[PDB]
Write a protein that binds this ligand. Structure first.
Ligand code: MG
Ligand code: MG
Ligand code: MG
Ligand code: MG
Ligand code: MG
Ligand code: MG
Ligand code: MG
Ligand code: MG
Ligand code: MG
Ligand code: MG
Ligand code: MG
Ligand code: MG
Ligand code: MG
Ligand code: MG
Ligand code: MG
Ligand code: MG
Ligand code: MG
Ligand code: MG
Ligand code: MG
Ligand code: MG
Ligand code: MG
Ligand code: MG
Ligand code: MG
Ligand code: MG
Ligand code: MG
Ligand code: MG
Ligand code: MG
Ligand code: MG
Ligand code: MG
Ligand code: MG
Ligand code: MG
Ligand code: MG
Ligand code: MG
Ligand code: MG
Ligand code: MG
Ligand code: MG
Ligand code: MG
Ligand code: MG
Ligand code: MG
Ligand code: MG
Ligand code: MG
Ligand code: MG
Ligand code: MG
Lengths: 197, 193, 136, 172, 191
RNA sequence: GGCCAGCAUCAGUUUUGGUGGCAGGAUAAAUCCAUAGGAAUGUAGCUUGCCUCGGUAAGUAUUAUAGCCUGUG
RNA sequence: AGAACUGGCGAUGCGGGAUGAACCGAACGUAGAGUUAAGGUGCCGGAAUACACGCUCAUCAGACACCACAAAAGGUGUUAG
RNA sequence: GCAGUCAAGCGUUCAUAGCGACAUUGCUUUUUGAUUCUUCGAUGUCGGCUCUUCCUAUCAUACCGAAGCAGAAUUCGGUAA
RNA sequence: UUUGCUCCACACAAUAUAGAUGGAUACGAAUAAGGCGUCCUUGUGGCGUCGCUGAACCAUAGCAGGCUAGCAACGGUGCACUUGGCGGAAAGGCCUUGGGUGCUUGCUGGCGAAUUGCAAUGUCAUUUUGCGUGGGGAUAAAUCAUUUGUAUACGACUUAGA
């Protein structure tokens, strides 16, 4: 529908976000995902911490360097949920994956580009009220991720600039509405009402 | 951590310049000769790099080198390195830094008597070492065939791979080490019988 | 320094609450909650729009902000009489919701020529507005 | 077993010379179709009478429709069923708009709570509870209070495209 | 079975105004002001009038409904704590070694420093929590007093002290040494 | 007329829509209409006790200034 | 380890049970179109993140015949009786 | 070989601090048997030496809950390899 | 080593392409709550309004978009300039001034289109490189061999040499 879709991970549930992201790439839609630190997983923090430690013990006994690799960053926990939903040892699969990008925070390009959401993976739409859940960033710091603070700091900075932007814009569309209303009631506008506009 | 700029002194001793080369004698020694020209223009582009470090920068390290010529060594080529500056505000740091270009700094300005310090250095080299002395493994008995400074069992039958955790012959020494807590007993001065 | 406690003012399932039916032979049609079966199921009735008295899932319906006085479990004739009385239809019709529904129904019926007329007309409109938007 | 119709079924043991005109017995039966219905009939007659289908005959089979299908009713429901380790009688109450609707949710309920498949259940009686206050089970009493109203918090709308440009709102 | 709604009442008295957006509760009164975050629960606060507030749960289960009352309690104890306030009294208890308890400070501190416990050369320290103040009761022997607007911080600061003086490697039935909470009340008297 | 296509009219197989006429059953059951009777999650009225001028509540009260249930046609 | 009756594997590919001699479906000439079996339909992966009523929250939940295990006993967790 | 359930008894008194009969439910696969699938056109025994890694049904070491824990000493139990 | 390198420009030739074909159209936060407007005592404030999907918004007419005239506006927008400022998370982009110039389907005119034959993607994007031309610009090093021994089985390392 658009050349590149930018997804605001915040408030999405990992494997449901993954399931849709994977399909899209396979079908040829480039996807970039931001604020993976604000991803969720159902299940209380402790549960998913225990799960993560299960993962953590699997290693190649003769050489741990060849063994399963354990990435600690929310973006990359995420990639993992994703990568495992893609026939990723096939050309067709590598190709789909090159179509993907994932970030903690919203770094340049994407901070001035619109981001969407994916309602069929929106936690607030899916999880029954009262069911505990985990935030990706908090899970990740506990298994080694080093950059929650730095991301938080940048994000607060970015969030201030974006508040300005918004404000300016909302000021501007107020003017624009003031304009659109002198033109209301005019002849060309009554005609357009007639045609559903 | 990522570096965004480096600002350099305008004059550089041949001692450092030499570090930037693999064949000094043959070379035209053109290192930094355009950089040096940046000072000409009033200072314009040097200030703004300095400016840039101040505006941003979570940390400031300074670039120093040794005066290996003041040393009985034969190896002319000096050692260059980044030392993190730790007093004041970031801006005070780069002010310190700019102020000290081409200028010189002494151990007493950094260490004192009875201080506990650490030492970072590459360990002596010993080349290819067998298992006994490299790992402190027990000499096999005198009767054993095929030699005896070895490990008798290099692993069980399964895993059917030699493992990362058993001792094997190979290089010994010329390692990085970070050794800590060495008390300073004297801070001597060169100009002092 | 009064207390000031939010609110949260949900539409209620309740006898006399009008609902807009979202899928089925009816669909897009209004109806009234007559009686109330359990947390998930109500008895609805919509004579004015020709929707049969029936049991239905709340989930098949979307509650509207309109209510009118209805006796619990009132039959169809009563329903039609009270409905007309409270004139819910013009009330609905006046709502932005209703209007937004009529809008896109009209948009969807546009002829290809009409589409081309809309465009000409928006160029026309854009001209004078983009003007106004530069003199204040 | 499905979406139920309710059937009157009438049978009798076959006539004989010395006993022409045998007695004629009736059952109401909830089934998805008349084939299952006649089957169920023979199933219960044999738990009650010396008969079986080879020596009996179906006399009539008719669907009974609800008298007042758009009138909400409070049902009392009486069931026999088997569990994994014994067999048990039960009384439940179901609020709906027809016996037929009511019996569907019963099997559903029996399957969900007690894990009883259809084979394991005997409906003993389904009867409309005429006076509120002979209503016994509180999960229904609850829906009989005067001027009853309740909101439906946390509204969740079905998206029709995989991407959305807003950020939904569960208001309602 | 899911109860279609149960609700609770929260009386409000003359001194105080309570103010709740999202589920962030603010209670102001004569003794200061407390706030508490109820977002983790799902309940609907309604003002009926300046001395009454309802909290309710729609279509709730046992565990949910079970949380209605404790919400009511929590905000009740915010209101009273802001009118009467809370006072917790504890007593030192020892059979031979007199337990010595002062207030100390290191970098804007306020710590409760417990010394000599069961003879211990060790020096026990408990921080004072903010909003709780400490008096060593005159006219009563070996009594400490912790008071403040918040039952939560007062009670927890008390519990910290009684837990910093657990006995180890001893029959704690005989070795009864400790600092135990002895009375739980309000600050403003008559009430 | 070699190569490959497009459309039309057909034939074999098949898929997927729109629409017409009928048969059955409690000659569907309902709604609706008429009629008799009734009740309460009791509509008007009335009583009484509080209560900022009528709002509540707890009584009476079976169609009145809402309605519903059940049978019969 | 040993018999009975049938059906299979051995001598047999094909679709399903991830994998597998024997289970489920179905038995094979070379091909087109259609429709199904058993089994499936979040993504891997063709196919409803379909509809509907309940139940379940596990600091070692559970997840489909053959089949890749769990018992006595016990719970003021919760459900219905 | 290891661990439970019931609780008659043991334990001055007192079933369950620590134990536990008659019964009875299990788990384990460093015991020994039972089997005979793979290897008899070869997969070289027992012990020790050396060396790594793993399990936990924990002997010591950290922190705990019990006691027929006064103290010292000990015993039972939990998180723990 | 036979006139080489680099940035900008156009020119011919290639080579390609995980897949342009109107637009990736920027708050944050909450969901048992919010957006927007508006007032004010500027607050966990009053009042109004909206949702119930982007089925939107923006753009969109002209030989794939030709050649031309005029009017009404003084608006819009393309391009190359120029003024002031911002953005380091991967800023490499955003904003602002001012003159110039093109287009304007805001409205009204003149001319052109066929024969590509009843369809045939009917060719309109963006990759990397190669070769000459001429506007700026810039004028090294590494390796072998030799040598040190803080290094070394051999390579490697570390020194030294106009
Ligand atoms: Mg381990
Ligand atoms: Mg730079
Ligand atoms: Mg040696
Ligand atoms: Mg040694
Ligand atoms: Mg040594
Ligand atoms: Mg020998
Ligand atoms: Mg050895
Ligand atoms: Mg102890
Ligand atoms: Mg002791
Ligand atoms: Mg052809
Ligand atoms: Mg045909
Ligand atoms: Mg028909
Ligand atoms: Mg009424
Ligand atoms: Mg054979
Ligand atoms: Mg076969
Ligand atoms: Mg896969
Ligand atoms: Mg698929
Ligand atoms: Mg079975
Ligand atoms: Mg299997
Ligand atoms: Mg139970
Ligand atoms: Mg053994
Ligand atoms: Mg016994
Ligand atoms: Mg005892
Ligand atoms: Mg005894
Ligand atoms: Mg054998
Ligand atoms: Mg052999
Ligand atoms: Mg062999
Ligand atoms: Mg051999
Ligand atoms: Mg071998
Ligand atoms: Mg253990
Ligand atoms: Mg413990
Ligand atoms: Mg005793
Ligand atoms: Mg270990
Ligand atoms: Mg382990
Ligand atoms: Mg490609
Ligand atoms: Mg609002
Ligand atoms: Mg506002
Ligand atoms: Mg407001
Ligand atoms: Mg829009
Ligand atoms: Mg044009
Ligand atoms: Mg023209
Ligand atoms: Mg980037
Ligand atoms: Mg050139």
């Amino acid at each position: 529908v658009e050349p590149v879709v930018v997804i605001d991970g915040k408030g999405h549930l990992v494997g449901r976000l993954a399931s849709v992201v994977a399909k899209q790439l396979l079908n040829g839609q480039k996807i970039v995902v931001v604020r993976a630190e604000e991803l969720n997983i159902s299940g209380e923090f402790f549960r998913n911490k225990l799960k993560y430690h299960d993962f953590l013990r699997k290693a190649t006994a003769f050489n741990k360097t060849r063994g399963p690799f354990h990435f600690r960053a929310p973006s990359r926990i995420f990639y993992k949920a994703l990568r495992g939903m893609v026939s990723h040892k096939t050309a067709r699969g590598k190709a789909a994956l090159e179509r993907l990008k994932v970030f903690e925070g919203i770094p340049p390009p994407y901070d001035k580009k619109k981001r969407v959401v994916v309602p069929q993976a929106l936690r607030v739409l899916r999880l029954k009220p009262g069911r505990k859940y985990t935030t990706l960033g908090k899970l990740s710091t506990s298994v080694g991720w080093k950059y929650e603070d730095v991301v938080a700091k940048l994000e607060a900075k970015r969030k201030v600039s974006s508040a300005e932007y918004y404000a300016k814009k909302r000021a501007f569309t107020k003017k624009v509405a003031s304009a659109n209303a002198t033109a209301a009631e005019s002849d060309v506008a009554k005609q357009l009402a007639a045609l559903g506009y | 951590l990522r570096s965004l700029t480096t600002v350099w002194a305008e004059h550089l001793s041949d001692e450092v310049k030499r570090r930037f080369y693999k064949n000094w004698y043959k070379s035209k020694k053109k290192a930094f000769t355009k950089y040096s020209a940046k000072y000409a223009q009033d200072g314009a582009g040097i200030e703004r790099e300095l400016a840039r470090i101040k505006k941003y920068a979570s940390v400031v390290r300074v670039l120093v080198h040794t005066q290996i010529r003041k040393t009985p060594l034969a190896q002319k080529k000096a050692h260059l390195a980044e030392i993190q500056l730790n007093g004041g505000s970031i801006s005070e740091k780069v002010d310190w830094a700019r102020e000290h270009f081409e200028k010189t700094v002494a151990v007493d300005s950094v260490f004192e008597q009875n201080e506990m310090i650490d030492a970072i250095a590459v360990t002596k080299g010993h080349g290819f070492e067998g298992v006994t002395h490299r790992w402190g493994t027990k000499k096999l008995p005198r009767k054993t065939h095929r030699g005896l400074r070895k490990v008798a069992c290099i692993g069980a039958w399964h895993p059917a791979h030699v493992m990362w955790s058993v001792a094997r012959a190979g290089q010994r020494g010329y390692h990085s080490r970070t050794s800590i807590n060495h008390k300073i007993y004297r801070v001597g001065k060169g100009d002092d019988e | 320094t009064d207390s000031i406690v939010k609110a949260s003012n949900w539409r209620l399932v309740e006898v006399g609450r009008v609902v807009l039916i979202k899928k089925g032979q009816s669909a897009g049609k209004l109806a009234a909650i007559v009686e109330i079966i359990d947390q998930k199921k109500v008895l609805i009735d919509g004579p004015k729009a020709g929707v049969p008295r029936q049991a239905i899932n709340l989930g098949q319906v979307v509650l509207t902000p309109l209510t009118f006085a209805l006796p619990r479990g009132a039959r169809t004739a009563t329903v039609s009489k009270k409905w007309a009385a409270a004139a819910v239809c013009e009330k609905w019709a006046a709502s932005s919701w209703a209007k937004k529904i009529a809008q896109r129904e009209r948009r969807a019926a546009l002829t290809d020529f009409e589409r081309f007329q809309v465009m000409v007309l928006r160029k026309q409109k854009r001209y004078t507005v983009k003007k106004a938007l530069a003199k204040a | 077993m499905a979406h139920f119709k309710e059937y009157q079924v009438i049978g009798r043991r076959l006539p004989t010379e010395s006993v022409p005109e045998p007695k004629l017995f009736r059952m109401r039966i909830f089934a998805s179709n008349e084939v299952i219905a006649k089957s169920r009939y023979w199933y219960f007659l044999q738990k009650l009478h010396k008969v079986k289908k080879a020596s009996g005959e179906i006399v009539s089979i008719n669907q009974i429709n609800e008298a007042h299908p758009t009138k909400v009713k409070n049902f009392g429901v009486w069931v026999r069923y088997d569990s994994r380790s014994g067999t048990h009688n039960m009384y439940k109450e179901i609020r709906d708009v027809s016996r037929v609707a009511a019996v569907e949710t019963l099997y559903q309920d029996m399957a969900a709570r007690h894990r009883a498949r259809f084979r394991s259940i005997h409906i003993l009686k389904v009867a409309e509870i005429e006076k509120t206050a002979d209503v016994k089970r509180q999960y229904v009493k609850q829906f009989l209070t005067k001027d009853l109203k309740f909101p439906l918090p946390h509204r969740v709308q079905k998206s029709t495209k995989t991407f959305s440009y807003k950020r939904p709102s569960t208001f309602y | 079975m899911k109860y279609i709604q149960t609700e609770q009442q929260i009386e409000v008295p003359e001194g105080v105004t309570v103010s709740i957006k999202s589920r962030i509760v603010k209670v102001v009164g004569p003794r200061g002001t407390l706030t508490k975050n109820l977002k983790h629960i799902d309940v609907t606060f309604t003002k009926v009038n300046n001395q009454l507030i309802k909290v309710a749960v729609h279509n709730g289960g046992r565990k949910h409904v079970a949380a209605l009352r404790t919400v009511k309690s929590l905000v009740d104890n915010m209101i009273t704590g802001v009118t009467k306030g809370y006072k917790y009294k504890m007593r030192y208890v020892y059979a031979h070694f007199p337990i010595n308890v002062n207030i100390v400070e290191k970098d804007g501190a306020k710590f409760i420093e417990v010394r000599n416990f069961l003879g211990d050369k060790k020096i026990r320290n408990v921080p004072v929590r903010d909003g709780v103040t400490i008096e060593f009761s005159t006219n009563v022997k070996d009594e400490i007093v912790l008071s403040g607007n918040s039952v939560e911080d007062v009670s927890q600061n008390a519990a910290d002290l009684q837990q910093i003086c657990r006995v180890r490697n001893k029959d704690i039935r005989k070795f009864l040494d400790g600092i135990y909470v002895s009375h739980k009340g309000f600050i403003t008297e008559d009430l």
